[PDB]
């Protein structure tokens, strides 16, 4: 049905993101063969007279005879009467380790044992067990264990968890800041309940007073029902209208009337269902969902290959010579399906302009890049390699003749911030980053925001460490003490960038950024090399060690894929116009790349052949090195090849 | 289009006496090697030998692409030394066309790999294997080459 | 004064630990030539009787003559004057950004400007700013900004803003879920007052509010005096009865009367610039503050001293050989004076028997921790790289007699189940840590328990690596399959796998082992090998250029260092008896400066000296084969790296 | 108390012209590099060419220092020749005893420092300084050594 689907989809959704609260019910305790209250004033009313009432209490009589039995009697036999029923120690019953299993953020529960306690110790997380009016001040973790009700951990007395409708009576007055934290889970977070029926009408009053303050702005909760008799139509819109959201087991499953445990059984498995790509079944849905997913980055133009897999959440292994391999999915070919359409036009044309809007998007980049199939009918490869940065062209002239040209948007002055850090001088580029910042969310811009703010974090990390180098040896090497920047422009960044750390940067964004920008992250820690060389460190060994002697083949032996990478992240900040394009770790990766096609091609040159040596690629690459490479080694290159390997 | 050296090599392999055929093919790695070493073997003899020809060779051989096969596996499931057979096409530099291919055999391989990676991030399947090309007391063993392109 | 000494120490103590949280006054919105509030209450009664009151208004007055104009015209001119009073940008004020500063939890806004906006926006972070019932519930974020006053972004209305008599009548209703979750923010954070008048008592409300019950659990937020009166001892006194925590302005510094700046900002940067330690004064509280932070250190059992992150929150550098260099010193010398301390013998005895035991204790430590003398006074030392092991070399013998027995510390176990796991038997070795965690929940010792859950992942990750190719592998190089798990031992291994993860392992802790055990981050994720190699290989190519041109280095510019950091990782991941050693190239890890280790010798037995080889370093260091270079050997050889070395 | 060994060093810098106080405390890395060599300076002509006596000597010095002084430093704040004297000492392997200080001096000496430090993250400042040896046309300079092991 569409309301139990529907439902369903929305705590899964809001699951995602970590906004799940679980309402431990009393249920779930009595759901452990746990006695009840119903056992629990049996000796009262013993004491009372020798005879329980026929028939149920009203709402105020079990309420009512503890009470009685107390002032009665003497709070010494109520906490000796309390010690005879609370002394009993159960196991769990898989109904915690489901509930468990849903992966929580907040716990609150008010039956009073700790079952739920001690099932989450088992299962190895970290909560604050919170019961006391004292305990919250002393959060000692961002996860909080609230029990409104009150454990017995301090003990089996009236200060720890009590049933006495005097205090009932004593409302908030007692515990206020439990209360105050109730109303904030519950405000916050999306509520679910399990374990209870209808009996607690102080619950419902909360409930009914706090939709009558957020008025239509007011998240419905949802509830479980465990009746095997069905309720009725009436009481569903009377709940409706009144704020709770009501999940039936009984529409669910059938069973016996006295089968209890396996209708909560049921309702966990109806929970436990939490996927995305199980539903991709209809050939369109494929490339809905696919746009759905890769829209939102058309303001970058370019993206990594092995980085790509980190947008689809591993599924496939992105091999770099850009054919795609399976890696976690477990679910249809939808890149399967992609790539046997590419190849079919006749498939091409039984589409409509709604799918061609999208084609039309993807077309761009995605040949931009240039993936063509996957690696098992692939035949001879073949890559492009091109480089539109002019700032690599070498040609400033006509840079600073594009920065004398006014402004355009948004996009523009991104591309102008570039070149003006280009030139090297600093101070009115930072005064660019500063208004784009200002002005970024006017245009409401994703990924450029986050582009910024690195941006003008390497550029002040530039600043400081041309300064920290000009501090001292400057005034040897020069003389004079060159001071380019206004002790004023030094102030005002010194003070308006104290404590700012990079690691947060990833942690203070809007969470609606990340579900959009997971691959881009990785440009703002100091994995922005670690991922890269590790590889080339490991390749780098290997075709060394592979030596002259065999793992011989025309194209698969040695540095092909280090080709591919190499121009694949060569432009990818040389062509979204990031910054630190003059940073060590580039002179890094461009001589070590340098060297081992290099190497490669001249192992091949002079290595022995017996018969089967040049049987084997009987042709060579040689390395006919582009101006690309040229200008790289005029750029990040000191040993520059020659000097230390021709000695070598 | 501008520079990328690429070409395609399987990897291929059967049973020694035996219709089974269950392996990876299409290894992208299909490494392979070669050496002959001496040693002082030979420091002192009777002052009257004719020749031996020791000569101490060594043959590495390693295949990964993983995807070996399921019916056999299932057959076997429940020491013939195996056979190997290898192709290489290779493409003529004045007119690039697919005209010759290289045929390589072995009779004997023994599959000698380390059987614990363990690596903490886990990789896509990845099955390195390794060969060491076995040979009899016989004759022949070692590579059996076919030349193509008979044109 | 000695108040003002606990009041900045306290201040310091909620400046890391998150516990913070500011509530902006309205002198700082004052002071960005925002029209006051008494200016627009002149222009009401300007418009409605044409005259100007002659005296002070009174309290009510104040809120009081906008209900007259709201009667009697209307919300035309009401919204009229909104326009137009409120329709003026303002430049920002620095304030803003010194609060700012040490990021606090959230933000408490009274004021209807969005100065604060403006200082949150460039600063970096974005805020889930709430102003209104619908605000709240599409909070995504968990960074909030609070305006208590309300914001403009509706529109100029007077519905939207709580500048009406009705309303803070009505308050209790109209906005009340703002109202709760700022009470909670009360609660569970710490708060500090600035800027804020003396018409309203935002303080007196709440405070009594809170006071109402408040019985034993509240911390006193801290109020700086602002005005240049000074404060009196009848005032403090009845505040501090009252519940607040008022620090003078002047009673630090003076100025004149008018110069809000300098005294403000005075009183602001005396707390901001405290970093860690400028009021330790005496050798008291030299010896406590090193204590709150190493105590813990004596847990562990071996650490590298290249791990010691931030001992004293990078305050100090520790080296290779483990010497000082100050990093992050403007206060107090503290680690000079413990360490003089030890120098000295007769300054020992100043020390109580408490506190020579400890001074012991820690003399005893920094012994065993390879920590010596500083670089001031570093002369000839020699640190003991005697290595203490018992299965890297392997006396299976001894572990074989060492399992038959029962323990009684959590540590026996532990180390019990390294050494079973090490010979292979990995079965038992999950319910042993289940054991652990199990029962190691009612203590407090956590370092254990960490080490225990990552052992885990770790394990069954070989494990899976395993079993995959034993169903493939297997009959590749045995011939016979073999089944070394059963299927349920397989079934509950998955069922645990399925719903667990290792990204969130550390974030899983509670905070007292996030602050006592801090360094214990980098080694539970994977790239530290992947971290430390590229480190390595920086190693490399200076070692190796070295070697190319021949250089002479003075000291230890060892490759030593390289294998002297091999050694430090060859112990760590051993000591703590942790399965980490058994991954995948870690073997190769090892290999490459191991086969570099020989080529750099082999190379260097070629020393053309010219006239400085003799005379600086007569019987030369020599190369020698090391035992546990032999160990590693024995523990790590391939053959084809035998294979190339021999061709080399 | 294995062999955790290591030495240390002393560096002297100092201005010409004047009796500036310059000096570094410590010099860990101190990578001293030399080079001879030659590849093609001789035309081959008038007969008997009588003469070659070219070689290329360059002294390379290179210590990283955190102690600049102040007592001039602020005065400059609000060139020469940067002359070195090198300071180290000797030890006998027969007795391990101290006797013998090594002194190596240059008396012109020009910094070449280069301006591209560029890392992303924050040191422990060791600001690493790269000296060249510059000669005169004159006579002498380079290097002097004083022997100080008389007994």
Redesign the interface.
């Known amino acids: 049905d569409n309301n139990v689907v529907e439902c369903i989809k929305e705590i899964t959704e809001s699951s995602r993101?970590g906004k799940l609260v679980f309402f431990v019910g009393a249920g779930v305790s009595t759901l452990s063969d746990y006695p009840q209250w119903w056992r629990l004033v049996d000796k009262y009313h013993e004491e009372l007279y020798g005879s329980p009432k026929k028939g149920n209490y009203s709402s105020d009589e079990y309420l009512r005879i503890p009470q009685i039995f107390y002032n009665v009697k003497g709070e010494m036999a109520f906490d000796g009467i309390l010690k005879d029923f609370f002394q009993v120690d159960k196991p769990t019953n898989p109904i915690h380790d489901k509930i468990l299993?849903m992966?929580p953020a907040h716990v609150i529960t008010t039956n009073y044992d700790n079952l739920i306690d001690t099932a989450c110790?088992?299962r190895?997380?970290?909560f604050s067990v919170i019961s006391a009016?004292?305990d919250?001040?002393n959060?000692?973790?961002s996860r909080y264990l609230l029990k409104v009700a009150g454990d017995f951990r301090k003990g089996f007395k009236g200060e720890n968890v009590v049933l006495k409708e005097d205090d009932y009576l004593n409302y908030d007055?007692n515990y206020?800041?439990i209360s105050?934290?109730m109303?904030?889970i519950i405000?916050?977070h999306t509520i679910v309940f399990i374990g209870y029926g209808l009996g607690d009408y102080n619950i419902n009053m909360l409930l009914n007073w706090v939709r009558k303050?957020?008025?239509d702005?007011?998240?419905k909760p949802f509830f479980i029902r465990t009746d095997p008799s069905p309720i009725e139509n009436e009481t569903l819109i009377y709940y409706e209208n009144k704020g709770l959201r009501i999940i039936d087991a009984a529409s669910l499953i059938d069973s016996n009337e006295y089968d209890y445990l396996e209708r909560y059984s049921a309702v966990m498995d109806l929970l436990i269902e939490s996927q995305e790509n199980k539903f991709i079944t209809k050939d369109d849905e494929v490339i809905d969902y696919i746009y759905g997913k890769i829209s939102p980055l058309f303001a970058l133009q370019y993206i990594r290959k092995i980085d790509l897999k980190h947008v689809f959440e591993y599924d496939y292994?992105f091999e770099v010579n850009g054919t795609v391999?399976?890696?976690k999915n477990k679910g249809f070919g939808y890149m399967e399906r992609f790539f046997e359409l590419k190849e079919s036009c006749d498939e091409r044309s039984k589409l409509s302009k709604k799918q061609y809007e999208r084609f039309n998007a993807l077309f761009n980049f995605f040949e931009k890049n240039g993936v063509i199939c996957m690696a098992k009918d692939?035949?001879?490869?073949?890559?492009?390699?091109?480089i539109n940065s002019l700032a690599y062209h070498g040609k400033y002239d006509v840079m600073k003749k594009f920065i004398e040209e006014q402004s355009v948007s948004i996009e523009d002055d991104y591309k102008k911030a570039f070149f003006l850090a280009c030139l090297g001088r600093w101070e009115e580029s930072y005064d660019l980053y500063?208004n784009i910042?200002?002005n970024s969310?006017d245009e409401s811009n994703g990924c450029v925001y986050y582009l910024s703010?690195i941006n003008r974090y390497?550029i002040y990390?530039?600043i400081t460490?041309?300064v920290?180098?000009f501090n001292?040896?400057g005034?040897?090497?020069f003389?004079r003490?060159y001071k380019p920047f206004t002790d004023e422009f030094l102030a005002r960044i010194e003070?308006?960038m104290?404590?700012?750390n990079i690691d947060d940067?990833f942690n203070?964004?809007?969470?609606?950024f990340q579900k959009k920008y997971k691959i881009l992250e990785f440009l703002s820690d100091?994995?922005?090399?670690?991922?890269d060389?590790?590889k080339l460190?490991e390749l780098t060994?290997k075709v060394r060690?592979?030596?002259s002697?065999?793992?011989?083949?025309?194209?698969?032996?040695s540095?092909?894929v280090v080709?591919?990478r190499l121009?694949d992240n060569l432009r990818f900040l040389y062509e979204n116009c990031l910054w630190?394009v003059?940073?060590?770790?580039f002179h890094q990766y461009i001589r070590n790349s340098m060297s081992l096609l290099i190497e490669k091609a001249e192992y091949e040159r002079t290595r022995d052949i017996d018969?089967?040596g040049f049987?084997?690629f009987?042709?060579k690459?040689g390395f006919?090195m582009?101006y690309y490479d040229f200008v790289n080694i005029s750029r990040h290159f000191k040993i520059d090849d020659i000097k230390?390997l021709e000695?070598? | 289009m501008k520079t990328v050296i690429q070409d395609t090599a399987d990897v291929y392999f059967k049973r020694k006496s035996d219709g089974k055929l269950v392996f990876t093919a299409e290894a992208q790695t299909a490494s392979f090697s070669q050496a002959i070493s001496e040693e002082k073997l030979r420091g002192g003899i009777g002052n009257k030998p004719l020749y031996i020809l020791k000569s101490e060779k060594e043959i590495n051989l390693t295949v990964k692409n993983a995807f070996f096969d399921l019916e056999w596996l299932a057959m076997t499931q429940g020491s013939e030394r195996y056979e190997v057979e290898y192709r290489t096409i290779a493409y003529n530099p004045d007119t690039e066309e697919v005209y010759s291919d290289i045929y390589i055999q072995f009779p004997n391989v023994s599959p000698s790999g380390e059987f614990e990676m363990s690596l903490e991030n886990g990789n896509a399947l990845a099955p390195e294997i390794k060969f060491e090309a076995l040979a009899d007391t016989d004759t022949d063993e070692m590579a059996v080459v076919i030349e193509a392109s008979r044109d």
């Open positions: 993101n299993a992966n110790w088992k190895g997380k970290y009016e004292e919250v001040a959060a000692t973790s007055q206020p800041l105050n934290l109303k904030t405000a916050t303050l957020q008025k702005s007011f998240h292994h391999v399976r890696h692939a035949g001879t490869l073949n890559t492009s390699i091109e500063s910042i200002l969310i703010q390497r990390q530039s460490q041309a920290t180098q001292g040896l005034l040897l090497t003389g003490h003070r308006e104290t404590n700012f940067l203070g964004m809007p969470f609606e100091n994995q922005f090399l670690y991922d060389t590790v460190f060994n060690s592979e030596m002697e065999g793992s011989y083949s025309f194209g698969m032996s540095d092909i080709l591919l121009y630190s003059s940073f060590h770790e018969e089967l049987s084997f009987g042709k690459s006919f582009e230390n000695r070598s």
